[PDB]
Motif scaffolding. Structure first.
Motif, mmCIF file in Angstrom:
data_model
loop_
_atom_site.group_PDB
_atom_site.id
_atom_site.type_symbol
_atom_site.label_atom_id
_atom_site.label_comp_id
_atom_site.label_asym_id
_atom_site.label_seq_id
_atom_site.Cartn_x
_atom_site.Cartn_y
_atom_site.Cartn_z
ATOM 1 N N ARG A 148 114.622 68.854 56.995
ATOM 2 C CA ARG A 148 115.745 68.382 56.032
ATOM 3 C C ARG A 148 116.937 67.702 56.713
ATOM 4 N NH1 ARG A 148 116.605 74.179 52.390
ATOM 5 N NH2 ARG A 148 114.990 74.066 51.130
ATOM 6 N N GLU A 149 117.186 68.090 57.750
ATOM 7 C CA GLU A 149 118.431 67.428 58.323
ATOM 8 C C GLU A 149 117.835 66.279 58.953
ATOM 9 O OE1 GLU A 149 121.487 68.184 57.884
ATOM 10 O OE2 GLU A 149 120.796 70.199 56.894
ATOM 11 N N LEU A 150 116.926 66.118 59.581
ATOM 12 C CA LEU A 150 116.249 64.896 59.842
ATOM 13 C C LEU A 150 116.260 63.771 58.785
ATOM 14 C CD1 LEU A 150 114.817 62.910 61.926
ATOM 15 C CD2 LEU A 150 112.651 64.243 61.453
ATOM 16 N N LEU A 151 115.746 64.311 57.834
ATOM 17 C CA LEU A 151 115.611 63.539 56.416
ATOM 18 C C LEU A 151 117.179 62.803 56.091
ATOM 19 C CD1 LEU A 151 114.397 61.912 54.000
ATOM 20 C CD2 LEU A 151 114.687 64.349 52.626
ATOM 21 N N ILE A 152 118.142 63.830 56.014
ATOM 22 C CA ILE A 152 119.585 63.389 55.664
ATOM 23 C C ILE A 152 119.997 62.653 56.671
ATOM 24 C CG2 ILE A 152 121.805 64.348 55.344
ATOM 25 C CD1 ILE A 152 119.775 64.767 52.871
ATOM 26 N N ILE A 153 119.951 62.779 57.746
ATOM 27 C CA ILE A 153 120.396 61.869 59.158
ATOM 28 C C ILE A 153 119.882 60.401 58.820
ATOM 29 C CG2 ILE A 153 120.399 61.567 61.476
ATOM 30 C CD1 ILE A 153 120.711 64.600 61.631
ATOM 31 N N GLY A 154 118.598 60.389 58.720
ATOM 32 C CA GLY A 154 118.008 58.909 58.548
ATOM 33 C C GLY A 154 118.714 58.271 57.206
ATOM 34 N N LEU A 155 118.846 59.129 56.006
ATOM 35 C CA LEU A 155 119.216 58.529 54.837
ATOM 36 C C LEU A 155 120.718 57.928 55.140
ATOM 37 C CD1 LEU A 155 118.043 58.418 51.870
ATOM 38 C CD2 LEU A 155 119.482 60.482 51.682
ATOM 39 N N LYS A 156 121.391 58.671 55.896
ATOM 40 C CA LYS A 156 122.983 58.312 55.835
ATOM 41 C C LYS A 156 122.881 56.734 56.785
ATOM 42 C CE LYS A 156 124.985 62.751 56.972
ATOM 43 N NZ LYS A 156 125.977 63.536 57.950
ATOM 44 N N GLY A 157 122.045 56.541 57.525
ATOM 45 C CA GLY A 157 121.933 55.438 58.143
ATOM 46 C C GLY A 157 121.362 54.333 57.218
ATOM 47 N N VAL A 158 120.254 54.672 56.528
ATOM 48 C CA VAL A 158 119.922 53.676 55.311
ATOM 49 C C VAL A 158 121.065 53.291 54.340
ATOM 50 C CG1 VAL A 158 118.305 53.180 53.551
ATOM 51 C CG2 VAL A 158 117.663 54.568 55.588
ATOM 52 N N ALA A 159 121.907 54.258 54.117
ATOM 53 C CA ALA A 159 122.934 54.327 52.966
ATOM 54 C C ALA A 159 124.277 53.109 53.746
ATOM 55 C CB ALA A 159 123.491 55.519 52.878
ATOM 56 N N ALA A 160 124.160 53.160 54.684
ATOM 57 C CA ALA A 160 125.251 52.462 55.549
ATOM 58 C C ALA A 160 124.943 50.792 55.290
ATOM 59 C CB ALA A 160 125.631 52.843 57.031
ATOM 60 N N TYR A 161 123.402 50.742 55.736
ATOM 61 C CA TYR A 161 122.930 49.156 55.721
ATOM 62 C C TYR A 161 122.853 48.761 54.265
ATOM 63 C CZ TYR A 161 121.548 49.892 60.465
ATOM 64 O OH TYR A 161 121.286 50.099 61.636
ATOM 65 N N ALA A 162 122.694 49.951 53.210
ATOM 66 C CA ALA A 162 122.635 49.372 51.819
ATOM 67 C C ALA A 162 123.997 49.110 51.234
ATOM 68 C CB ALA A 162 121.963 50.535 51.244
ATOM 69 N N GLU A 163 124.872 49.910 51.897
ATOM 70 C CA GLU A 163 126.496 49.559 51.321
ATOM 71 C C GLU A 163 126.823 48.091 51.898
ATOM 72 O OE1 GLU A 163 128.280 50.479 49.374
ATOM 73 O OE2 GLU A 163 130.206 49.752 50.213
ATOM 74 N N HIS A 164 126.663 47.831 52.908
ATOM 75 C CA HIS A 164 126.700 46.314 53.305
ATOM 76 C C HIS A 164 126.281 45.249 52.373
ATOM 77 C CE1 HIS A 164 129.457 47.637 56.650
ATOM 78 N NE2 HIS A 164 128.367 48.276 57.374
ATOM 79 N N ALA A 165 124.974 45.345 52.212
ATOM 80 C CA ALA A 165 124.290 44.534 51.150
ATOM 81 C C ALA A 165 124.815 44.625 49.935
ATOM 82 C CB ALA A 165 122.710 45.239 51.139
ATOM 83 N N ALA A 166 125.195 45.587 49.288
ATOM 84 C CA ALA A 166 125.954 45.972 48.083
ATOM 85 C C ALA A 166 127.097 45.078 47.798
ATOM 86 C CB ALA A 166 126.007 47.287 47.847
ATOM 87 N N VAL A 167 128.145 45.044 48.980
ATOM 88 C CA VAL A 167 129.272 44.392 49.252
ATOM 89 C C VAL A 167 128.998 43.088 48.865
ATOM 90 C CG1 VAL A 167 130.811 43.506 50.887
ATOM 91 C CG2 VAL A 167 130.543 46.115 50.372
ATOM 92 N N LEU A 168 127.744 42.615 49.493
ATOM 93 C CA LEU A 168 127.496 41.170 49.323
ATOM 94 C C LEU A 168 126.730 40.589 48.344
ATOM 95 C CD1 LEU A 168 126.650 40.474 53.303
ATOM 96 C CD2 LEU A 168 128.607 39.467 52.040
ATOM 97 N N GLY A 169 126.703 41.524 47.418
ATOM 98 C CA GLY A 169 125.939 41.269 46.013
ATOM 99 C C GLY A 169 124.366 41.526 45.801
ATOM 100 N N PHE A 170 123.675 42.299 46.836
ATOM 101 C CA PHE A 170 122.484 42.358 47.096
ATOM 102 C C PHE A 170 121.865 43.968 46.829
ATOM 103 C CE2 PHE A 170 120.807 38.343 48.515
ATOM 104 C CZ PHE A 170 121.956 37.596 48.799
#
Ligand code: SF4
Length: 553
Positions: A148-170
């Motif tokens: 469970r924690e492995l999944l949430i730890i990986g998901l946080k990393g993905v969410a950070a990258y996705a937030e940067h993309a979202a800021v730029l319109g993507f």
């Protein structure tokens, strides 16, 4: 408290009284309660999608909330209390919507039991006590806890990258839907095979999200190109920008043009020096200092205002004097530090206060002189493909060693410096992320005019390293990516580095050395599964690992 999500966790087992990073009991527990509330949003959000009436109104809230809990991102308890209150209100709106749609589709009221995350509520005075009971140790079975924690730890990393993309319109809907699927999964009792499948799906979504951010950064600011970056100082007052967000950099550069204040990068903002869009400003001086963990003395010596756009922000020492010139923005927060508010849609952040302050400050203290070369992202390297391939063919380059990843404080990390220095002269080091600072100011020279260290950029630009390896595989006509003359010796620290690791495993890379320790969040049984599937290895001695890698092993 209990937290184990970064490489520096106490005894490689878990921080339980105060974090080794500095995070105190109360802040650690509030982060747990926010993740609890996010699982409650995910339960209803997933059910509405199932019933054919998906609601996307919380997409950015979920990304920002996960990002705020990443190591060294946000230290301000008041910010967590605000997000928890907002998250409860968002969850209750989804609950009401779900109840009505369920009744319309089923002809009766919903009456099944739900996890507590879906129902608990209180005012702010209830938060601190509830927080103690909703943390990691609530999962008793060690293997379920690990997965469970492995999944949430990986998901946080993905969410950070996705937030940067979202800021730029993507944005891609699949990514935001996955956030809810993954979070909701951690409230369900699932088989081991099902939990491992979700971890691999997260590795797949890390590939998708790193691709999206590569597209957003390069479409907006250009492809990175070979660049010589000054590391000494000029004679004007300056502003130092740290973190990873390139849109904040673009606005800071525009607003500083013509004011007599210079701009300097720090840490993971180094790669901003590589982008065509930013290279056209004369007052963009260069990069100051070293890796994130050396920031207390270097932010002090910089003299001018410091802006953190993301992690890593380290707490000040008692002796440090820069609180009154420290600014946070985005998901970053720190008690007593001024915060730059989010931009309106289509508009920009307001950095006027930093510029006003900097005009009052002395120029930076010089800490070194010279230059660094970088800018070898996928477009640039593929442009040189003929030459690199030719060089492989003649045997002038015998091996690539990927040493990408994230740096940290522990003395064992001198391993990475000593590997770099003791590799044979016919090898090239490929890097991205702040792990670079262990060897990027050595003079290792070149082979035929190719630098022996090739910097592709921020940790997210590990994506370029995969694209390069995939192309070389096609050029050399190999059936298996693992038979390229490439070895992987990757250092990790926080949750973005875990997302990069999961992406490499999804692409089928085996035999990775990961260091300087393996994660505390792998239980024995779960570690076994990863070893037997993917042949992940710990680091050994410098001599022993070099000999091994040069042998393809
Ligand atoms: S983020 Fe790392 S050092 Fe900080 S409390 Fe968690 S495991 Fe410990």
């Amino acid at each position: 408290m209990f937290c184990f999500q970064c490489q520096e966790t106490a005894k490689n087992t878990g921080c339980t009284v105060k974090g080794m990073c500095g995070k105190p009991e109360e802040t650690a527990n509030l982060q747990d309660l926010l993740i609890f509330v996010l699982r409650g949003i995910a339960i209803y959000g997933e059910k509405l999608k199932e019933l054919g009436q998906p609601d996307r109104s919380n997409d950015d809230f979920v990304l920002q909330g996960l990002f705020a809990t990443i190591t060294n991102a946000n230290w301000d308890d008041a910010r967590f209390e605000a997000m928890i209150s907002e998250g409860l209100a968002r969850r209750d709106k989804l609950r009401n919507a779900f109840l009505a749609v369920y009744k319309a589709k089923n002809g009766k009221d919903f009456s099944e039991p739900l996890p507590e995350a879906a129902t608990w509520t209180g005012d702010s005075t209830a938060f601190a006590e509830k927080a103690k009971s909703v943390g990691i140790l609530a999962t008793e079975n060690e293997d379920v806890r690990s997965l469970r924690e492995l999944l949430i730890i990986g998901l946080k990393g993905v969410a950070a990258y996705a937030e940067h993309a979202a800021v730029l319109g993507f944005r891609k809907t699949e990514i935001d839907e996955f956030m809810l699927e993954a979070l909701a999964s951690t409230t369900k009792d699932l088989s081991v095979d099902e939990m491992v499948a979700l971890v691999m799906k997260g590795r797949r979504m890390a590939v998708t999200t790193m691709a999206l951010l590569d597209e957003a950064n390069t479409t907006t600011y250009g492809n990175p190109e070979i660049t010589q970056v000054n590391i000494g100082v000029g004679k004007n007052p300056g502003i130092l920008i740290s973190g990873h967000d390139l849109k904040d950099m673009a606005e800071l550069l525009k607003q500083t043009e013509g004011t007599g204040v210079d701009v300097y990068t720090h840490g993971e903002m180094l790669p901003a020096n590589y982008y065509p869009a930013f290279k056209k400003y004369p007052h963009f001086v260069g990069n100051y200092g070293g890796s994130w963990w050396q920031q207390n003395p270097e932010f002090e010596s910089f003299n001018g205002p410091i802006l953190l756009t993301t992690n890593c922000l380290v707490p000040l020492k008692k002796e440090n004097t820069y609180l009154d010139r420290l600014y946070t923005t985005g998901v970053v927060g720190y008690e007593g530090a001024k915060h730059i508010a989010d931009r309106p849609a289509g508009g920009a952040k307001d950095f006027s206060a930093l510029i006003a302050q900097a005009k009052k400050c002395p120029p930076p203290v010089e800490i070194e002189t010279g230059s660094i070369v970088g800018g070898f992202a996928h477009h640039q390297v593929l442009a040189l493909a003929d030459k690199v391939v030719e060089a492989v063919k003649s045997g002038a380059i015998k091996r690539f060693v990927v040493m990408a990843g994230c740096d940290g404080r522990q003395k064992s990390r001198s391993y990475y410096t000593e590997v770099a220095e003791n590799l044979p002269k016919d090898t090239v080091i490929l890097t991205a992320g702040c792990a670079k600072y262990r060897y990027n100011k050595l003079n290792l020279g070149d082979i035929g005019g190719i630098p022996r260290v090739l910097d592709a950029g921020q940790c997210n630009d590990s994506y370029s390293l995969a694209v390069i390896a995939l192309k070389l595989k096609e050029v050399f006509g190999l059936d298996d990516i693992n038979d390229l003359p490439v070895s992987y010796d990757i250092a990790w620290y926080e949750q973005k580095a875990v997302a990069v690791l999961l992406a490499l495993l999804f692409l089928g890379v085996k035999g990775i050395r990961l260091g300087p320790t393996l994660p505390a969040f792998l239980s024995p049984n779960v570690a076994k599964v990863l070893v037997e599937n993917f042949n992940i290895k710990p680091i050994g001695t410098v001599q022993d690992d070099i000999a091994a890698m040069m042998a393809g092993k």
